[PDB]
Amino acid sequence: SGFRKMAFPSGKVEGCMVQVTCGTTTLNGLWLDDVVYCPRHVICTSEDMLNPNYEDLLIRKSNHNFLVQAGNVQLRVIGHSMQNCVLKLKVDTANPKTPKYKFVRIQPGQTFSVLACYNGSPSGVYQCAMRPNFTIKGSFLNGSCGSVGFNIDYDCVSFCYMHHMELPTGVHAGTDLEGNFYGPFVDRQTAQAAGTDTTITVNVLAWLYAAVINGDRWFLNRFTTTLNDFNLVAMKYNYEPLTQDHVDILGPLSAQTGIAVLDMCASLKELLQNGMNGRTILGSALLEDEFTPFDVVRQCSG
Amino acid sequence: SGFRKMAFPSGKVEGCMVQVTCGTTTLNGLWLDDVVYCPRHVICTSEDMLNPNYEDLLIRKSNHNFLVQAGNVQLRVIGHSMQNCVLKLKVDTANPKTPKYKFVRIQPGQTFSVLACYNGSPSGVYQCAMRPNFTIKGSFLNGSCGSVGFNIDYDCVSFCYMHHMELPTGVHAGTDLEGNFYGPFVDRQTAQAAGTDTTITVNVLAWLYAAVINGDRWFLNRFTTTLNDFNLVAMKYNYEPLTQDHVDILGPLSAQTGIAVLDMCASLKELLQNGMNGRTILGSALLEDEFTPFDVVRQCSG
Ligand SMILES: *S[C@@H]1O[C@@H](CO)[C@H](O)[C@@H](O)[C@@H]1O
Ligand SMILES: *S[C@@H]1O[C@@H](CO)[C@H](O)[C@@H](O)[C@@H]1O
Ligand SMILES: [Cl-]
């Protein structure tokens, strides 16, 4: 019993974290096989971040300018390239701790774990979610850049995120491991703003299902609703619109609990219209949206 | 910027998790040097857990009855003993992945990370706190028993918790790595109840300091208070009494923010008497008490 915001074990990723230093800037990199991946703004000074021409700034750099340190050993850069907003440093040694891995571009609403690093050294791990506006609400300080987000299915690590920037609002923006930013953001120190951050409705419903499984049932009402009717309430409260795909994904949870999906939608509707009246669900006074339906099943079964 | 409930990287502990099987029961063990540590109720059936005589049940067991499997390799038990409520299986091979480690008995109010396992396989990591009533609010399902809680300072892993039981109320109780239970609990399937669970006042104050550091300042009032006066409010709301030691520990945070401790106590007093009025602090509608003063400093500095 009990429900916590659990992150995947981070060991397989700890063994891939390195320190990349270009000039005076040191950030974290990801060493997989014979390639180190890092944010390309490692090649930028302070003046550069205003409006950097990354192509021109890379022309002034050679292999020996990129200092890659794994633990206390130094790595020999035999090649370097730029893929979108990520720099790929080819080293002469394959990482002996490379796990089975793939690069994945996740969708808004999906969850993943973050290993937050500083100078190629792990500091902590936490579970977060890609917000619908393609931002992440994490904990990143200077030097964190190059910190990676990942999932693990069996022995396969799916890297999906690399931290790049902290927006002026305090949220965070990054790329997939191919250097493509999530959202409209660019790796420049300019005026960038996220859109409306909506609540991931399907995740809230999964979390309400977890609550029922764990004993918290007070929110369960005597009513039901329709998908169109519920989506009307969702818009007024800036909730993601619920599709039939979303309903289909919660099937396994609806089966385990004996609670229809539209029945749970009617309980959530009441919670948005009336609030919690000071009560708590799973030790939280807000509706939590950073647990996917797959996360609830995986935690309740493990 | 940003504040998350961060757990220590779990890699050093992942390499120590093994699967112990005695009879039909399989739970997790901790392999350090040439000793495997596991809950002693591994030697118990279902009838036994009612009122087990662990000494008599161990007399019926020999070294070859304890099956210890690390990954896909089997370990040779050359000795076995019982220390309080933990079983120490001496194996013939030292764990090559043993980190620098020590056994620590933490105090109520302290935090630690938990690597939740099942059959010696990691499933997830999360950050929790020893409640003042010596329980922990985690996520443990059958087979989780033997899951360990730890801290990491530099390269030193301080193991402080091993999961043993889930109480009828849904909270969890366990031991230090010397087999001594936290709290009055016993490893029997009997009627055991935790006392009043109070809120860790010093941790809430640390969290309010983190909020200020991150921009959330609305709770900051124009008032102050005294230690005796505040403790009066703490008792009415089942908050831990605040000592001068607690005030001294928050010194570094009071220095960084320029907010006196008794000034922050007066803001918390208002929050307990009036509530949040629907507002949120660091994305939470409740007062969070699972961040120690040392945790806030470590996260804001890392
Ligand atoms: S990580 C991903 O899947 C694994 C199997 O789970 C394969 O071994 C890898 O080659 C692949 O990238
Ligand atoms: S883990 C603890 O401290 C370390 C140093 O940080 C020592 O090396 C260990 O022997 C000790 O148990
Ligand atoms: Cl909350």
Domains of chain A and CATH, by start: 1-14+100-197 (2.40.10.10), 15-99 (2.40.10.10), 198-301 (1.10.1840.10)
- In the PDB record, what is the listed experimental method? X-ray
* A282 CA to centre of own chain: 23
Specify the long-range contacts of residues A104-107, CB closer than 8 Å, at least 24 apart: A104/A151, A104/A158, A104/A159, A104/A160, A104/A176, A105/A160, A105/A176, A105/A178, A105/A180, A106/A130, A106/A160, A106/A161, A106/A176
Instruction: State the nearest Cα–Cα gap between A60 and chain B, in angstroms.
Output: 32
Is A283 at the interface with chain B, CB within 8 A? Answer: yes
Q: Which of A103, A152, A156, when mutated, tests ligand 1's pocket best, judged by the most ligand atoms within 8 Å of its CB?
A: A156
| Rounded Cα gap, residues A138 and B123, in angstroms | 22
**CB-CB neighbors (< 8 A) of A286 in chain B:** 280, 283-285
Which is the catalytic residue, given A85, A145, A160, A265? Answer: A145
Beta strands in chain B, from DSSP E residues, in sequence order: 17-22, 25-32, 35-39, 67-70, 73-75, 77-83, 86-91, 100-103, 111-118, 121-129, 148-153, 156-166, 172-175
Least CB-CB distance to B139: which of A3, A170, A285? A3
- Residue whose structure tokens are 């087979």: B143
Is B211 at the interface with chain A, CB within 8 A? Answer: no
Could you tell me the two tokens for A74?
Answer: 């130094």
Angle A59-A63-A66 (CA atoms, 0-180°, nearest 5)? 95
Whole-number Å distance, alpha carbon A211 to ligand 3 midpoint, is 14
Coil, strand, or helix at residue B298?
A: helix
**CB-CB neighbors (< 8 A) of B283 in chain A:** 137, 286
Is B217 at the interface with chain A, CB within 8 A? Answer: no
**CB-CB neighbors (< 8 A) of B171 in chain A:** 2
Q: Which of B16, B33, B102, when mutated, tests ligand 2's pocket best, judged by the most ligand atoms within 8 Å of its CB?
A: B102
**Three-state secondary structure string covering chain A:** CCCCCCECCCHHHHCCEEEEEECCEEEEEEEECCEEEEEHHHHCCCCHHHCCCHHHHHHCCCHHHCEEEECCEEECEEEEEEECCEEEEEECCCCCCCCEEEECCCCCCCEEEEEEEECCEEEEEEEEECCCCCCECCCCCCCCCCCEEEEEECCEEEEEEEEEEECCCCCEEEECCCCCECCCCCCCCCCCCCCCCCECHHHHHHHHHHHHHHCCCCCCCCCCCCHHHHHHHHHHCCECCCCHHHHHHCHHHHHHHCCCHHHHHHHHHHHHHHCCCCCCECCECCCCCCCCHHHHHHHHHC
| Rounded Cα gap, residues A115 and A122, in angstroms | 7
Instruction: State the nearest Cα–Cα gap between A124 and chain B, in angstroms.
Output: 5
Torsion of CA B243, B246, B251, B257, to 10 degrees: -100
**CB-CB neighbors (< 8 A) of A9 in chain B:** 10-11, 14, 115, 122-125
CB contact under 8 A, A125 and B7: yes
Whole-number Å distance, alpha carbon A12 to ligand 1 midpoint, is 13
The candidate with the shortest Cα–Cα distance to B122, out of B150, B85, B93, B94, is B150
Interface of B with A in 81-120 (CB under 8 A): 115-116, 118
Q: Which residue of A has its CA nearest to B295?
A: A124
**CB-CB neighbors (< 8 A) of A215 in chain B:** 170
Least CB-CB distance to B215: which of A14, A128, A170? A170
Residue A236: count of CB within 10 angstroms of its CB: 9
Residue A67: count of CB within 10 angstroms of its CB: 15
CB contact under 8 A, A170 and B2: yes
CB contact under 8 A, A115 and B9: yes
Which residues of B are annotated as catalytic? 41, 145
- Residue whose structure tokens are 């020590």: B102
Q: What residues line ligand 2, using a CB cutoff of 6 Å?
A: B 100-102, 154-156
CB contact under 8 A, A14 and B11: yes
Backbone angles phi, psi at B117, to 5 degrees: -130, 165
Whole-number Å distance, alpha carbon A32 to ligand 2 midpoint, is 30
Q: What residues line ligand 1, using a CB cutoff of 6 Å?
A: A 100-102, 154-156
- Helix (H) / strand (E) element for B271: namely helix B261-274
- Residue whose structure tokens are 């796990």: A99
Could you tell me the two tokens for B178?
Answer: 């010397």
Instruction: State the nearest Cα–Cα gap between B286 and chain A, in angstroms.
Output: 6
Instruction: State the nearest Cα–Cα gap between A133 and chain B, in angstroms.
Output: 17
The candidate with the shortest Cα–Cα distance to A13, out of A132, A114, A140, A129, is A114
Specify the long-range contacts of residues A179-186, CB closer than 8 Å, at least 24 apart: A179/A40, A179/A82, A179/A83, A179/A84, A179/A85, A179/A86, A180/A84, A180/A85, A180/A105, A181/A84, A181/A85, A181/A134, A182/A130, A182/A134, A182/A135, A183/A133, A183/A134, A183/A135, A184/A134, A185/A134
| Rounded Cα gap, residues A286 and A280, in angstroms | 8
Residue A112: count of CB within 10 angstroms of its CB: 23
Are A167 and A192 within 8 A, CB to CB? yes
Could you tell me the two tokens for A136?
Answer: 């992440």
Burial classification of residue B252, based on how many CB atoms lie within 10 Å of its CB (0-12 exposed, 13-18 middle, 19 or more buried): middle
Question: Quick one: which atom of ligand 2 is closest to the CA of B155?
Answer: 6
| Rounded Cα gap, residues B265 and B270, in angstroms | 9
A128 is an active site residue: no
Whole-number Å distance, alpha carbon B13 to ligand 2 midpoint, is 15
Residue A196: count of CB within 10 angstroms of its CB: 7
Whole-number Å distance, alpha carbon A284 to ligand 3 midpoint, is 4
**CB-CB neighbors (< 8 A) of B116 in chain A:** 6, 302
Whole-number Å distance, alpha carbon B155 to ligand 2 midpoint, is 7
